[PDB]
Design a protein around this ligand. Sequence first.
Ligand SMILES: [Zn+2]
Lengths: 48, 1088, 146, 49, 86, 93
Amino acid sequence: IPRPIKSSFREGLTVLEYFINTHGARKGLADTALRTADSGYLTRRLVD
Amino acid sequence: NSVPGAPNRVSFAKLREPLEVPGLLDVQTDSFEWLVGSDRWRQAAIDRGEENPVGGLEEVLAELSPIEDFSGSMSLSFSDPRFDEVKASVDECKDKDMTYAAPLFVTAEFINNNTGEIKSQTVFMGDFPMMTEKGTFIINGTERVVVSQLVRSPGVYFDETIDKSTEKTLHSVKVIPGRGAWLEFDVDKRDTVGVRIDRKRRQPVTVLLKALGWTNEQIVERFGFSEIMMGTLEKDTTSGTDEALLDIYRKLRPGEPPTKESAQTLLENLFFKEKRYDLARVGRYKVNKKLGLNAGKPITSSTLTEEDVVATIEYLVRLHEGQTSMTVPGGVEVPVEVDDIDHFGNRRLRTVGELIQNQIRVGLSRMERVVRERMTTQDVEAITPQTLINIRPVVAAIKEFFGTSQLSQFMDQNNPLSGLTHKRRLSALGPGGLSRERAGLEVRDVHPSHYGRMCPIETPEGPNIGLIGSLSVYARVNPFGFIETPYRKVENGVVTDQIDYLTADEEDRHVVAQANSPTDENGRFTEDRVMVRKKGGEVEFVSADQVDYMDVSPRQMVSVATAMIPFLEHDDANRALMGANMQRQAVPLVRSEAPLVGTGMELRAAIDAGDVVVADKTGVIEEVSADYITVMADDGTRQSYRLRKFARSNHGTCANQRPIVDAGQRVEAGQVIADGPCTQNGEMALGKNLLVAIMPWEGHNYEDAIILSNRLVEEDVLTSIHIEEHEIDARDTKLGAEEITRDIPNVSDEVLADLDERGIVRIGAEVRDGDILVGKVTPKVRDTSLKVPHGESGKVIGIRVFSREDDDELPAGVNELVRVYVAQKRKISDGDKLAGRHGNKGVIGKILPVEDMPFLPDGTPVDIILNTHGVPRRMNIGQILETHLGWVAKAGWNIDVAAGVPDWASKLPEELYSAPADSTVATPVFDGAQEGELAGLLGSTLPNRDGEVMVDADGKSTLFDGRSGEPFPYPVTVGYMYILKLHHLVDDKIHARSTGPYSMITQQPLGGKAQFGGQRFGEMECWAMQAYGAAYTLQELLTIKSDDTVGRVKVYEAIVKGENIPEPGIPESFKVLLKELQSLCLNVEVLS
Amino acid sequence: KRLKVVAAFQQSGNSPMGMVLDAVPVIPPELRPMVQLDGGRFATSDLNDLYRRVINRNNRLKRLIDLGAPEIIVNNEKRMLQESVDALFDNGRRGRPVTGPGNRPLKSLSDLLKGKQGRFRQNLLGKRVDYSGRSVIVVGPQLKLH
Amino acid sequence: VGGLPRVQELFEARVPRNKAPIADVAGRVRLEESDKFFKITIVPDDGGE
Amino acid sequence: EQDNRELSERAAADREWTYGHVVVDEAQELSEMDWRLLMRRCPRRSFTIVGDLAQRRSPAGARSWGAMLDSYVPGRWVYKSLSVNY
Amino acid sequence: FFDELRIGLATADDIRNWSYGEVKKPETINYRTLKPEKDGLFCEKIFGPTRDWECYCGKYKRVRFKGIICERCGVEVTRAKVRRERMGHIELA
Ligand SMILES: [Zn+2]
């Protein structure tokens, strides 16, 4: 997003800044089971 | 304020809220009102909108009336639904294990078209589960909540999908009603338009057009702006309507012979007959807004017509050809544009009302059938409607939705906020929704259409991430089902006070400003590069007269648990998410205390939820006890409120209420008369303010663990009450009848100490695992008594006993029922979980005596020690600021304005210039305490009892070690933080097993905390163990401990006797498998 | 594809004469248990039924072959025996299953060690190990690594 | 993006998407190129094909 | 599987290909069936036919344009000329 | 002890050998008196006894003498644990 966040968590993000920073956060909390599953699949193979 | 009894809670807010937060659970009540045509809703509609306000029952009964047969000699209609008073109150229901319902009535008229004789007859439709003032239902005694479902709106949805084989663009459309068949058009790589009906084999759309009575001249007139369409015309082996109707009937009804009339009536009663196909009213709205049809004109009732099936194609072509406009012949201009699926213009909300409507419709369809089938085989001139009618199906639908549905959920009664967020919850899963297969990662995303409509933070952390959500605070719900949020209106660069609620599509064709934008004395603007959001979720600098709207507050997108977080813009979304979902799991304490530093959002949450008691009418407190409050009002009437004492929730908590008013007091209306489980003077108190030191102690606060004083146990600060329910039924049996009594086969004579004459334990008696609560028997005779499960213990509160004889109510096969309610006061031990409102939790490692805690130069010990290592890599510093302000409050302040307000109190009100101790304050999430103000107020910080300031102007206080007595060489950040005790306790999460109950279907332990089952030993553990080379322990786990039977016996014996453990024989998973291959005549042999 | 089944019996100490059966074994009861229920009802598997069917057909066929009866009824009952035994081994593979009370196919012997409810897949999963517990962990730095 | 996909692409002996051709022989190269295409010819050092 | 051959090659290896435009120089040397093929190739009918009937060496030829085109693009084809010679 | 596992085709002699009898009746139990029937299924003579150390005759029940075949019922008296480790055959017509 070419609009950056020119504020820190010390100054305090504005409302929009705090809105466009939820996207990647939720992407992470979502992906962080598929990642585990892929690793486990590779490991299951390597073990078999 | 706007609340009569308003504990003064000063605010650092620098703006004025031009719009008071609405009722927070209206999303439920308004919808249930639309369903029963209540007069409030009827006028609310008439007051703005339409002229005939049609309800939600009226609507089904109209879309059902009249029930005719094939001939029409007779007809049977329903109308004018009525709701006569409820039988019993909410308490009477929650106690008698009964539902909160009202008799429903509807007039049923019958005609005899041969004669024409009316036989009007009022009817009894059933007892209809009604809805409480709190936004709930009460089903069979338990309190429930009908969550709202997110779905995709009916309509016509275009698309574009780069092709795979050829890397070619190719468009598609799709018409999706509430009921009917899916009609899809496409443009493929061969550049030939096509169609599919009931998702069947594909066809040239020209087939459909001609089937609709179109001649190639008509087509060439309408189309012809596109050569692909002319080509689909030429390259077609079916000319003439009837030939095309036969084509459709063939690719759609194979084996049955084509008949002219059959095909005509098929294409008629597939889309255009409003019995097998209906775009619900929202569907028609969406399909007219798009396509520019039926402009400025009713949407009363309709289904698919021809103009829409044709403008769909014109839109598809005009879009393939890459255009930005379409002006249908008669319709209006419209932008050509692909449709986003997760956009809220396209997604919509089924509220409790619509769900119940649908299930009532289902029951009514069953009733309609059953009516017909007894409407041919009866004697006319005799049949009233109450003969043709069997209401049973209806009730079942009702009783099958308020039970056996994934949207009627047991209420989250762990604390007021948990329920309040349960009721404002949006689900994208359930009957009619989706599942974890289709549920990918774009429905679980945040979309720029959620601003003011859905919270981008509140949602679970695991497999329900992004699907479940929570509705914002300033948002409401269109009658269609689309969520609206308010915006201030702006004219000529200056902002008015006219509030206009917008749904997304409207929001998208405007330039929307930001609340924190400056103004001066008028709402006018003083900057020029105003920050705005544009259509495509985009944000940018723009001019002044160029804004078409404005936001009311900064907290328009946040929710009700995320707005009770101070210093949010200083935390990160993950940790704020976790804080929110933590507050929502927080037990009620024996004594509640409100945040010394909070947000202007706890009072209103506590009111709207409903675990408090508010003055119905202004008046004067006549009498006050702990079980009753009595107000003699100003009009002469005497209201009498009753209080729930030690009331078990659905989660073991306590719902005790306690008054906060004294006799003779004069209360307004809207004033809090009693507090709840987690309120103090009407504002959420889910936790405690505790004196915290930010420092690493001697390794006992390592990796997120925490350290506590023992004053939090001595003074039962973080102590909770937990109640639990134990039920036993006494039913009949062949061998005999179960009779609950005191006497029992040979057992002790003391165990019957706490048992009264009836065999049920005696109140005020303390109990212990294995001890008896109530005595039941199955003949032989047997000892079938109820005993406390392992761990749980406490004192007998209550006994709720139901008997066949007394005739209260019971199920089938059962004759008697006893519920026991036993309580447990739980002080904060080690292993328990704590947290704060910023995503900072941790188990308790060490509970330290007060004399070894880091104490201050006042003698004041700290109460909790938190480590420095988890703060700066998690971005949850909002707790540091919280801590500082907590100090600033517990120890008041006075800015010295002798020479004038300093350069950092400029923006401050004239009410924060000073404050005494214990001075609660408010730092709203995005209009709150800045950092200069806080650094300055850390210096004022009135001295103590002895004229000394224990804390510097940086938040740091020199401390002393209670073990060495020597001071720590470096000053330490100290303050007061608001923390919370979580349902994740110890006793309810601890387990252990040596040998107990096994399955008897698999030869394994009955795996479960309730069945006293052991832990599992999966594949990965076996892998690790094999990688150690450990081979006798692995065999010990897989044979001696789980499945083997003689092995378990012999090992228990060998250990209880003291003889070395026997050695394996030959695997018993082999001594029998053999005896299966010797059965298939396989000569499996084992050899050396 | 055809050379394999022949090169097998080329060296296999055994010849293909086992594909054809002249005796058939039975399992030990504890694999076909039949137990009353706690209240008067019964609970069984469906292998005793298959063996009973086989044995009925076989004894009747024995008779038909002692009674000098025509070749046709002997032939018919022999087809029936083949069908019944093939069912017992793997009912549901060839043609139509042999349904039971509930129009359910009777669980054959292949259906005893094939699926995850099968004697092979078992012991490759979690077993609910006794002499075990679980709790919540806190930190002790007054401790040693062992 | 050569992470877990590449590991799965190797331990399973799969032909890669961006496959590169290798030299069946030693020697020198004659490199020609035309519109959107390379053509290499390996003249060996032994004196063969 | 994944060979993402360039457009020229992915196309020329397929007669079931729909182009987006078609140039034809010395187009008088073509036959009714040739144009049938071409117009089965481009359904968008976005041709740029060049030619000169009086430069024809073919006994299938055109002898006029409307002959071969009105069967595919009647009244919807433009005829421009280039009169000067330099 | 175990070193390898061989699997192969069974002959009729292998099945005649694995066995301890030859069942002939289509009888499993007596639904009335709840007892396995003779020369049928769940029999005690070729699969072993059900109650431990007692013959289906129920006479030579004491364990003090082991390794005898009660002539009446034919049930060698021993541990019932064999009813898992015991097979029989059927010499099909
Ligand atoms: Zn005997």
